[PDB]
Amino acid sequence: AGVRCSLLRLQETLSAADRCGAALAGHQLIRGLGQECVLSSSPAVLALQTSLVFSRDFGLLVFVRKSLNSIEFRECREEILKFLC
User: Are 9 and 29 spatial neighbours (Cβ–Cβ below 8 Å)?
Assistant: First the structure.
């Protein structure tokens, strides 16, 4: 499972100085992450993917609410809602 190494880099894009350019890494990184855990079929790796998507210090909803003052991150915040759907 790559899901945690993927999510760890998503928080880096939010903290990067080039906010305009870093959005392009973050979008395509969510676009990869949201293929990995829809594809899955094993109950105890589905445990990993239900555990770390909805993480508290880390994970997808923290990234939305912490990025929510930006206008650059629209592409991420659409994709991450499409994925959560």
Answer: yes
